[PDB]
């Protein structure tokens, strides 16, 4: 499928868009739905089966998600997104405002439209998290290659492509050194490739159009979501911005967030 249920119901449905990654440091929609009222059904977005995202553009991702919703016959009461997922949530919400008699609520959490900086920051955190297993020297080399890449390549799709080349090459080499089992290596490199594919596709969404009716929920992490933008730019971009003094990685597990979300969905 393209959607998985993460909370049950009888009723209008809530959609939630994010990139699934078990063991990631950031709280997930599952943490948020644990902290909501139990009636309302919530579905979380699934990525294409690994590798099959190659050759898909943003339109292909959105249509895949949209058509499963159309086929269900269900009405959508709200669309949620986290981080880059906020771009796809905004496009789905705008399409559902057109396809439904009543528009869904759109709530976006640290919304991001990925740039060359966010592709590079992410690559760094990935490589740093694997240093213990790739080994510190292999990790150094990957970081320097990705750094070179970000210094040379100015567009988002091109940088994404090369970072996936660098990472794939680093995983293949760690495998050949026997520092990684060769199924662990394949899964690692396929998953990073799926992630960058998702990010680059999310960047393609017209987020200025799609976030004009969004309520944003913002952490305190300066580099996350709307925080790098100046005040006037944040106010121009979204309909309303709630702030929370919590780390980006804790946003979806915060009880104050959950309480505010329940009121926004009431």
From TrEMBL:
Provenance organism: Saccharothrix syringae (Nocardiopsis syringae)
Lineage of producing organism: Bacteria, Bacillati, Actinomycetota, Actinomycetes, Pseudonocardiales
InterPro entries in UniProt: AB_hydrolase_fold
Entry protein name: NcmC
Tree of life domain: Bacteria
